[PDB]
Structures are given as C-alpha cells and as structure tokens.
Design a protein around this ligand. Structure first.
Ligand SMILES: *[C@@H]1O[C@H](CO)[C@@H](O)[C@H](O)[C@H]1NC(C)=O
Ligand SMILES: Nc1ccnc(=O)[nH]1
Length: 246
C-alpha cells in the first residue's frame, strides 16, 4: 500500500507520495528507460490500495489497477464505492470485501462521463493539494454529483501525477493554492495512451514514432512529438501503458 497525509503536506511529502505510488506499480522491463506496466495481473494483486488522509485525519482507501493506474473505486468508512464499469465491478470482487455496503456510482470512471456528472469540464476545476483535501472530505459522504468533481481532482493529483513528472510538479506548485490545470496538463492526460503506444512502437523503429503525438507545451503552444529524444519521453513520462492494453 501507499499513503498520503494532507496534514502538514508540502511539495516534498507530496513528491514522496508520488514516488511511492510509481514504485508500487510492478514492471518487468523498461522501454527507453521508462517502466512498462504489465499486460495483466490476476486476482487481488492487480489492485493497489492508496490510503489518503484529509487535513483532519479522516481517510479513504482508493483502489488502483496497477496495469493502467485507473482508479476503480474507494472505501469510505464502511461503504465501498465503485465505478459503473466492468473493470470496476471485477475489482469489487477483490477489494473492500469487508465493507458493510457497496454502492455502484452512477457513472463510469472515464473523464468524459465524470465531467458530465460533475456538470463541468476539468479545465474549469481547480486542482492542488487543497482541492485534494476537499475531494477526500467529499468522498467520505455519498453525494454522486459532488463525488464526480472530487474524483476528477483525485485522479489528476494521484494517477496523472504518477504518470507524468510535469503534472506532479504542477500539483507541487499548487501545494497551498488551487489552480485549474494548464492546457499542457490536460493534453498530457489525454495523450498518455497514445504516447505509451508510440514509445513502445519506437523500439523496433529506431526510436521514431509510427504516428506523431500532438501536445500543448508549458507556454500554451501546440507541438508535435515524433521521436524518443523529445523531453516528454526523456524527462516527463514515468510509466507506460502496455500496448497489449491499447
Ligand atoms: C526528433 O525529435 C527532436 C526533439 O523534438 C526534434 O528536434 C528532431 O527534429 C526529431 N528528429 C527526428 C529524426 O525525428
Ligand atoms: N487514472 C484514471 C482513473 C480513472 N479515469 C481516468 O481517466 N484516469
């Protein structure tokens, strides 16, 4: 398991949590020096538990699929909550079994459905450590509309930060003040699968992407990633979705 506590949290302790999260995801090889997530894992070993504590010390446990870093569901006191999707129902067979009741959320876990439920795109939702503290607090007591927004914050400040050093740094910059994500942040989130695939396809293509990936950069400018010498590949991305899952 991995843990993070918002009480006394600063950029350093957050960075330690994101390091812990990355290191909890198993891999057998690296591709261009980046850990390649496994094609599959069977049984309960597929799911990582993240223990998150809000400023007041209340806690949820979030279940994360270790092959793709997708949040499947979470436990708040004696109630489990899972996304309305087969991967999440499957996860419900293995985690939080001792919960007194299980609630299936009235949406799946993908960004498009969550944004619909939340009533806003995540371009408009501030993120940061304060927003994460709020999100944890919200998830403690069932409210499916508020939960959708909280889950958008949660996914971005955990999973997305694990996937990209840039996003981790953006959240560190928002340690004490929330701010909506940069366009670059949004772009990276949306491109993780594409980048993961192209970096793998480059293995037998001399480091050249079969299909270039269009990103937005730190300055709001739209750029093309064509090969593994790009900073996105050498710096930034920290985990690869296995092409077998793409
Ligand atoms: C590779 O990508 C680098 C970094 O973005 C770029 O400067 C260069 O033009 C590209 N070279 C090839 C061979 O694709
Ligand atoms: N890490 C993630 C979990 C759920 N949905 C996502 O889009 N990403």
């Amino acid at each position: 398991d991995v843990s993070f506590r918002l009480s006394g949290a600063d950029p350093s302790s957050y960075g330690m949590f994101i390091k812990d999260l990355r290191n909890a995801l198993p891999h057998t090889e690296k591709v261009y020096n980046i850990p390649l997530l496994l094609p599959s894992v069977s049984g309960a070993g597929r799911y990582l538990l993240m223990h998150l504590f809000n400023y007041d010390g209340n806690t949820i446990t979030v279940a994360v699929d270790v092959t793709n870093v997708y949040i499947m569901g979470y436990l708040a006191l004696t109630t489990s909550y899972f996304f309305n999707e087969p991967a999440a129902d499957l996860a419900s067979q293995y985690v939080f079994r001792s919960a007194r009741r299980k609630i299936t959320l009235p949406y799946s876990g993908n960004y498009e459905r969550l944004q619909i439920a939340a009533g806003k795109p995540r371009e408009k939702i501030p993120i940061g450590l304060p927003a994460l503290d709020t999100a944890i607090s919200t998830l403690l007591h069932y409210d499916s509309t508020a939960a959708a927004g909280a889950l958008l914050v949660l996914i971005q400040t955990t999973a997305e930060a694990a996937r990209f050093k840039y996003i981790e740094q953006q959240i560190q910059e928002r340690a004490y003040r929330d701010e909506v994500p940069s366009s670059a942040t949004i772009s990276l989130e949306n491109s993780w699968s594409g980048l993961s695939k192209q970096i793998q396809l480059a293995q037998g293509n001399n480091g050249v992407f079969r299909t270039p990936t269009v990103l937005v950069d730190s300055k709001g400018n739209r750029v093309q990633i064509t090969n593994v010498t790009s900073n996105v590949v050498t710096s930034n991305i920290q985990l690869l979705l296995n092409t077998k899952n793409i």
